[PDB]
Design an enzyme around this catalytic site. Structure first.
Site, PDB file in Angstrom:
ATOM      1  CB  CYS A 106     -19.861  -0.488  37.061  1.00  0.00           C
ATOM      2  SG  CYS A 106     -19.547  -2.154  37.774  1.00  0.00           S
ATOM      3  NE  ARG A 109     -16.786   1.830  38.156  1.00  0.00           N
ATOM      4  CZ  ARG A 109     -16.638   3.146  38.093  1.00  0.00           C
ATOM      5  NH1 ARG A 109     -15.716   3.665  37.279  1.00  0.00           N
ATOM      6  NH2 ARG A 109     -17.426   3.943  38.813  1.00  0.00           N
ATOM      7  CD1 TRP A 278     -21.440 -10.216  42.775  1.00  0.00           C
ATOM      8  CD2 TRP A 278     -19.866 -11.363  41.656  1.00  0.00           C
ATOM      9  NE1 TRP A 278     -20.212  -9.792  43.226  1.00  0.00           N
ATOM     10  CE2 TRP A 278     -19.230 -10.480  42.555  1.00  0.00           C
ATOM     11  CE3 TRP A 278     -19.075 -12.192  40.849  1.00  0.00           C
ATOM     12  CZ2 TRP A 278     -17.845 -10.403  42.671  1.00  0.00           C
ATOM     13  CZ3 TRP A 278     -17.701 -12.115  40.967  1.00  0.00           C
ATOM     14  CH2 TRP A 278     -17.096 -11.230  41.867  1.00  0.00           C
ATOM     15  CD  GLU A 283     -27.653  -5.155  40.313  1.00  0.00           C
ATOM     16  OE1 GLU A 283     -27.935  -5.044  39.093  1.00  0.00           O
ATOM     17  OE2 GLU A 283     -26.657  -5.777  40.723  1.00  0.00           O
TER      18      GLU A 283
HETATM   19  C1  HEM Z   1     -18.557  -8.516  39.422  1.00  0.00           C
HETATM   20  C2  HEM Z   1     -19.645  -8.081  40.069  1.00  0.00           C
HETATM   21  C3  HEM Z   1     -20.397  -6.812  39.626  1.00  0.00           C
HETATM   22  C4  HEM Z   1     -21.275  -6.137  40.385  1.00  0.00           C
HETATM   23  C5  HEM Z   1     -21.647  -6.487  41.834  1.00  0.00           C
HETATM   24  C6  HEM Z   1     -21.773  -5.016  39.614  1.00  0.00           C
HETATM   25  C7  HEM Z   1     -22.685  -4.087  40.026  1.00  0.00           C
HETATM   26  C8  HEM Z   1     -23.390  -3.218  39.234  1.00  0.00           C
HETATM   27  C9  HEM Z   1     -24.641  -2.539  39.537  1.00  0.00           C
HETATM   28  C10 HEM Z   1     -25.415  -2.705  40.847  1.00  0.00           C
HETATM   29  C11 HEM Z   1     -24.951  -1.748  38.486  1.00  0.00           C
HETATM   30  C12 HEM Z   1     -26.171  -0.844  38.234  1.00  0.00           C
HETATM   31  C13 HEM Z   1     -27.159  -1.729  37.467  1.00  0.00           C
HETATM   32  C14 HEM Z   1     -28.552  -1.148  37.435  1.00  0.00           C
HETATM   33  O1  HEM Z   1     -28.910  -0.432  38.404  1.00  0.00           O
HETATM   34  O2  HEM Z   1     -29.317  -1.425  36.463  1.00  0.00           O
HETATM   35  C15 HEM Z   1     -23.931  -1.932  37.494  1.00  0.00           C
HETATM   36  C16 HEM Z   1     -23.890  -1.306  36.282  1.00  0.00           C
HETATM   37  C17 HEM Z   1     -22.959  -1.548  35.298  1.00  0.00           C
HETATM   38  N1  HEM Z   1     -22.040  -2.559  35.304  1.00  0.00           N
HETATM   39 FE1  HEM Z   1     -21.339  -3.574  36.987  1.00  0.00          FE
HETATM   40  N2  HEM Z   1     -21.161  -5.055  38.377  1.00  0.00           N
HETATM   41  C18 HEM Z   1     -20.326  -6.139  38.340  1.00  0.00           C
HETATM   42  C19 HEM Z   1     -19.581  -6.524  37.244  1.00  0.00           C
HETATM   43  C20 HEM Z   1     -19.560  -5.948  36.013  1.00  0.00           C
HETATM   44  C21 HEM Z   1     -18.893  -6.447  34.828  1.00  0.00           C
HETATM   45  C22 HEM Z   1     -18.139  -7.806  34.802  1.00  0.00           C
HETATM   46  C23 HEM Z   1     -19.099  -5.543  33.856  1.00  0.00           C
HETATM   47  C24 HEM Z   1     -18.576  -5.528  32.400  1.00  0.00           C
HETATM   48  C25 HEM Z   1     -17.536  -6.291  32.051  1.00  0.00           C
HETATM   49  C26 HEM Z   1     -19.873  -4.451  34.412  1.00  0.00           C
HETATM   50  C27 HEM Z   1     -20.284  -3.310  33.777  1.00  0.00           C
HETATM   51  C28 HEM Z   1     -21.306  -2.482  34.141  1.00  0.00           C
HETATM   52  C29 HEM Z   1     -21.809  -1.371  33.362  1.00  0.00           C
HETATM   53  C30 HEM Z   1     -21.263  -0.925  31.976  1.00  0.00           C
HETATM   54  C31 HEM Z   1     -22.792  -0.809  34.068  1.00  0.00           C
HETATM   55  C32 HEM Z   1     -23.635   0.400  33.650  1.00  0.00           C
HETATM   56  C33 HEM Z   1     -24.892  -0.138  32.967  1.00  0.00           C
HETATM   57  C34 HEM Z   1     -25.823   1.002  32.624  1.00  0.00           C
HETATM   58  O3  HEM Z   1     -25.338   2.150  32.443  1.00  0.00           O
HETATM   59  O4  HEM Z   1     -27.045   0.741  32.524  1.00  0.00           O
HETATM   60  N3  HEM Z   1     -20.108  -4.744  35.705  1.00  0.00           N
HETATM   61  N4  HEM Z   1     -23.020  -2.828  37.994  1.00  0.00           N
HETATM   62  N1  LIG Z   2     -35.030  -0.267  29.354  1.00  0.00           N
HETATM   63  C1  LIG Z   2     -35.285   0.962  29.434  1.00  0.00           C
HETATM   64  N2  LIG Z   2     -34.855   1.647  30.498  1.00  0.00           N
HETATM   65  C2  LIG Z   2     -33.731   1.265  31.157  1.00  0.00           C
HETATM   66  C3  LIG Z   2     -33.833   0.505  32.318  1.00  0.00           C
HETATM   67  C4  LIG Z   2     -32.688   0.111  33.002  1.00  0.00           C
HETATM   68  C5  LIG Z   2     -31.434   0.490  32.536  1.00  0.00           C
HETATM   69  C6  LIG Z   2     -30.196   0.052  33.287  1.00  0.00           C
HETATM   70  C7  LIG Z   2     -29.748  -1.304  32.737  1.00  0.00           C
HETATM   71  N3  LIG Z   2     -29.140  -2.138  33.756  1.00  0.00           N
HETATM   72  C8  LIG Z   2     -29.129  -3.596  33.684  1.00  0.00           C
HETATM   73  C9  LIG Z   2     -27.855  -3.900  34.413  1.00  0.00           C
HETATM   74  C10 LIG Z   2     -26.757  -3.209  33.936  1.00  0.00           C
HETATM   75  C11 LIG Z   2     -25.539  -3.397  34.533  1.00  0.00           C
HETATM   76  C12 LIG Z   2     -25.435  -4.233  35.639  1.00  0.00           C
HETATM   77  C13 LIG Z   2     -26.531  -4.921  36.153  1.00  0.00           C
HETATM   78  N4  LIG Z   2     -26.405  -5.741  37.253  1.00  0.00           N
HETATM   79  C14 LIG Z   2     -25.333  -6.476  37.503  1.00  0.00           C
HETATM   80  N5  LIG Z   2     -24.950  -6.738  38.758  1.00  0.00           N
HETATM   81  C15 LIG Z   2     -24.524  -6.967  36.353  1.00  0.00           C
HETATM   82  C16 LIG Z   2     -24.798  -7.256  35.014  1.00  0.00           C
HETATM   83  C17 LIG Z   2     -23.639  -7.624  34.326  1.00  0.00           C
HETATM   84  C18 LIG Z   2     -22.451  -7.626  35.056  1.00  0.00           C
HETATM   85  S1  LIG Z   2     -22.853  -7.140  36.674  1.00  0.00           S
HETATM   86  C19 LIG Z   2     -27.764  -4.743  35.525  1.00  0.00           C
HETATM   87  C20 LIG Z   2     -31.326   1.262  31.382  1.00  0.00           C
HETATM   88  C21 LIG Z   2     -32.474   1.650  30.694  1.00  0.00           C
HETATM   89  C22 LIG Z   2     -36.100   1.600  28.354  1.00  0.00           C
HETATM   90  C23 LIG Z   2     -37.454   1.885  28.203  1.00  0.00           C
HETATM   91  C24 LIG Z   2     -37.750   2.505  26.980  1.00  0.00           C
HETATM   92  C25 LIG Z   2     -36.668   2.732  26.127  1.00  0.00           C
HETATM   93  S2  LIG Z   2     -35.259   2.129  26.937  1.00  0.00           S
HETATM   94 CL   LIG Z   3     -31.572  -6.984  36.691  1.00  0.00          CL
END
Ligand code: HEM
Ligand SMILES: N=C(Nc1ccc(CCNCc2cccc(NC(=N)c3cccs3)c2)cc1)c1cccs1
Ligand SMILES: [Cl-]
Ligand code: HEM
Ligand SMILES: N=C(Nc1ccc(CCNCc2cccc(NC(=N)c3cccs3)c2)cc1)c1cccs1
Ligand SMILES: C[C@H](O)[C@H](O)[C@H]1CNc2nc(N)[nH]c(=O)c2N1
Ligand SMILES: C[C@H](O)[C@H](O)[C@H]1CNc2nc(N)[nH]c(=O)c2N1
Ligand SMILES: [Cl-]
Ligand SMILES: [Gd]
Ligand SMILES: [Gd]
Ligand SMILES: [Zn+2]
Lengths: 403, 400
Positions: A106, A109, A278, A283
């Site tokens: 993330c 943070r 947000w 992304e």
């Molecule tokens: C407040 C604005 C926030 C921004 C701009 C932000 C930004 C991001 C971005 C760009 C990613 C990578 C997502 C991806 O590439 O799929 C990410 C991942 C993540 N975010 Fe944040 N985030 C925010 C808030 C939060 C909040 C509120 C939470 C949980 C309470 C959170 C928890 C996570 C987690 C656990 C991941 C890792 C997800 C994974 O491993 O796939 N984030 N965040």
């Molecule tokens: N979905 C797959 N792959 C995969 C693709 C993406 C991810 C990453 C998931 N990310 C979505 C995400 C996570 C956390 C943050 C964001 N973006 C945001 N800015 C926020 C979301 C919530 C608070 S901030 C988006 C993991 C596995 C798979 C294919 C086959 C088996 S699993």
């Molecule tokens: Cl997304």
């Protein structure tokens, strides 16, 4: 010795003493690094619960207090009587914030302390689940002025199935697996789209059809709920100076709300705890719209921009991708929907690193996920060495409820 | 135990079986990953291992000549403490060290390397001749050719050949009385050494540095590179006519001269190698890094971009046009260069070839993915396994 961590832009040097507290193990060994991979009992419950309670009482500077001891004793007695325990409301709030703070992938943070925690641990049904989710979507969207929130549904417990949200995010566009192998809509959502139709959703045929929610209450097949259209704030994409861009008919949704991760706090598990913040603009602009396996609009845009797509060396891809990102940021700003560009996000993450070094002596961070997908070395995080490790409370991946 | 490696664009799966042969240990543990860190008479066992590698690669495994070579090196180290590589072994070890380099995206080319055997070298004046012939061969009037020159190995009771410069071609870095640096901040240390060893400094942003060459047990000697030997590309932009007036330039030949080559337990502290540039090395890292020439805001000002808000993406637009200028300028000057899209597509091919050749390929994702347009290249979507194989190019302490 603890890992020496160097910033190559500044020359500055820190030591990550916090990593030595890493509980769970990651995928790397001295023989081989796997850092680039996407996917890396009364007594064990108790030591995780003890450690969590210790974290709670440190956060409020009452470590070793009578209230600290009594609570540890309290957790111990409940685990010995029932095999499990219940978080106090204040511990749940703290636990969800720590889990965000602990998330190595993330970049957002800097905000970890500002998190609205909705306590849905008394939820009884998939219908009440839908109500909690709608209230979350309304609070977090806040008509474009986005507010971070998490809704925590009941913990996993023996003798009862889990609450689950089958969708990976609360708002997703349909992906219709066309018969000729191709896809209409978002290819990342083909599987959830087929499950939605399987469960009686009447599908559309557009590229930006919001999916229904497949909600699972304990020991119950998932149930289909349609999001009220007025609850799903969307941004039509246009470009500040490329007027034909608007005619692409591109859109994206305001609110990123991840709904398929498991929240772990003090050894308790919450398989349904959707959380939202947000978007960072890359992304949407770079990944969702230009990934070859996503909307894959890069070549279409570059051709419209009159770029020479016949040779790589013209950098037509880089140029079209930059303008797509410009369009996303311009469009969200125009619509007054909170969004952050990758430059401001990574600068604020650098501030977070400095805060966490002072507060905890380090910060788990996954370099490959923190560095944005365009312009990596133009942002400061590129030049920052980072130590990746797993702390608890944590957000974790979990198997899909149908696989 | 064989790591599963997935490509997320294609959905394909392979298993890296070669990682099981990782000889050394990297910095990572199950507790924490340090993958992003820049710096992470048993000579016989290493010597043995390399010979077996050699004869296996030429399908002479366990044959008559295999056992004979094995017994030769045992006698050498018993007599002398070290042993001598056969010229073919040295060529094979150079190519393998390149092929094993986790951070090299250019490895599709690994079988095409000109090895210059300089192991009969003595004195720095000879080093300088070997180097100049390297630079002349490798430059080839702009049609660049990969090459390595291998100077004598280290041995006990005797010093080392070292090239004090990190590269054969480096621009000077001059510190100013207002703290700033005119020139290349990366080279402020070697520039003060060159001065402290007699060099008359320039006062320009692109003064090519002298070579500080060190023969064993002697102080290093300053050698000036003949300016006609050092091919340089003035930077211009195909459509922004003012770009040329910025006076930017870079040099044709990336020639790394500070890494240690290790072959079969032998160590060559001076073994400069050169290929050609990937354009993002020059246009993004060398010119736009904050701690290098840091020209990004200059270019954005000339492009009349709104530099007071990050969300205009002025840094991204300026970086792209700078990389365009680099690609245009090298192509116009007929100097070999590869853009990051072509290079990463080629590295993907290399991954497939290496999967079939050896069951895997050590790759450092952070270094393989380009510093701009990351996810627009296929390597971004490619999971990778990083591990250390030998022969290898290793970092080494500075001589001072
Ligand atoms: C407040 C604005 C926030 C921004 C701009 C932000 C930004 C991001 C971005 C760009 C990613 C990578 C997502 C991806 O590439 O799929 C990410 C991942 C993540 N975010 Fe944040 N985030 C925010 C808030 C939060 C909040 C509120 C939470 C949980 C309470 C959170 C928890 C996570 C987690 C656990 C991941 C890792 C997800 C994974 O491993 O796939 N984030 N965040
Ligand atoms: N979905 C797959 N792959 C995969 C693709 C993406 C991810 C990453 C998931 N990310 C979505 C995400 C996570 C956390 C943050 C964001 N973006 C945001 N800015 C926020 C979301 C919530 C608070 S901030 C988006 C993991 C596995 C798979 C294919 C086959 C088996 S699993
Ligand atoms: Cl997304
Ligand atoms: C033929 C064209 C080549 C291209 C386009 C190329 C490209 C690159 C690039 C972009 C890097 C990253 C360097 C950095 O970011 O500082 C690199 C690293 C490296 N290259 Fe290649 N290279 C080529 C040839 C060679 C040759 C001929 C050798 C040795 C015989 C070699 C050995 C290495 C090594 C050892 C590294 C790691 C450097 C380090 O860890 O600091 N490369 N290469
Ligand atoms: N050395 C440092 N850090 C450091 C910086 C860069 C690198 C990477 C090495 N840079 C030169 C290089 C190596 C390999 C390839 C290239 N570029 C090329 N395309 C080729 C060079 C030779 C054949 S291809 C450049 C390693 C450590 C320090 C900075 C400040 C104090 S120490
Ligand atoms: C193979 C590689 O791990 C994968 O493509 C990663 C790289 N870095 C990433 N970083 C972020 N933020 N999000 C991602 O999905 C990915 N994907
Ligand atoms: C801290 C980080 O490891 C460092 O900035 C790395 C990242 N990736 C890189 N990749 C390449 N090709 N070259 C580099 O110098 C770096 N630097
Ligand atoms: Cl360079
Ligand atoms: Gd226009
Ligand atoms: Gd002007
Ligand atoms: Zn690792």
């Amino acid at each position: 010795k603890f890992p020496r961590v160097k910033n190559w832009e500044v020359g500055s040097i820190t030591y990550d003493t916090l990593s030595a507290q890493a509980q769970q193990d990651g995928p790397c060994t001295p023989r081989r690094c796997l850092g680039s991979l996407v996917f890396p009992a009364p007594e064990q419950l108790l030591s995780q619960a003890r450690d969590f309670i210790n974290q709670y009482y440190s956060s409020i500077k009452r470590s070793g207090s009578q209230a600290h001891e009594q609570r540890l004793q309290e957790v111990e007695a409940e685990v010995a009587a029932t095999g499990t325990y219940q978080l106090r409301e204040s511990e749940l709030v703290f636990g969800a914030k720590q889990a965000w703070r602990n998330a190595p992938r993330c970049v957002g943070r800097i905000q970890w302390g500002k998190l609205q925690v909705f306590d849905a641990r008394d939820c009884r049904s998939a219908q009440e689940m839908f109500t909690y989710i709608c209230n979350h979507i309304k609070y977090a969207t806040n008509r474009g002025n986005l507010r971070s929130a998490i809704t925590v549904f009941p913990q996993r417990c023996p003798g009862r199935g889990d609450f689950r949200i089958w969708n990976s995010q609360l708002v997703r566009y349909a992906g219709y697996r066309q018969q000729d192998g191709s896809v209409r809509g978002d290819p990342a959502n083909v599987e959830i789209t087929e499950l939605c139709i399987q469960h009686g959703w009447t599908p559309g045929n557009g590229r930006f059809d919001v999916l229904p929610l497949l909600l699972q209450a304990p020991d119950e097949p998932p149930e289909l709920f349609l999001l009220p259209p007025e609850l799903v704030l969307e941004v039509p994409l246009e470009h500040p100076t490329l007027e034909w861009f608007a005619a692409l008919g591109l859109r994206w949704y305001a609110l990123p709300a991840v709904s398929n991760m498991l929240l772990e706090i003090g050894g308790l598990e919450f398989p349904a705890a959707p959380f939202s913040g947000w978007y960072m603009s890359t992304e949407i602009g770079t990944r969702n719209l230009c990934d070859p396996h996503r909307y894959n609009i890069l070549e279409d845009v570059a051709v419209c921009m009159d770029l020479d797509t016949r040779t790589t060396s013209s950098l037509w891809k880089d140029k079209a991708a930059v303008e797509i990102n410009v369009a996303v940021l311009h469009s969200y700003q125009l619509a007054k929907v909170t969004i952050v560009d990758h430059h401001a996000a990574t600068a604020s993450f650098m501030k977070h690193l400095e805060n966490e070094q002072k507060a905890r002596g380090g910060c788990p961070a996954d370099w490959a996920w923190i560095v944005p997908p365009i312009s990596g070395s133009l942002t400061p995080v590129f030049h920052q060495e980072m130590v990746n490790y797993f702390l608890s409370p944590a957000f974790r991946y979990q198997p899909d409820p149908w696989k």
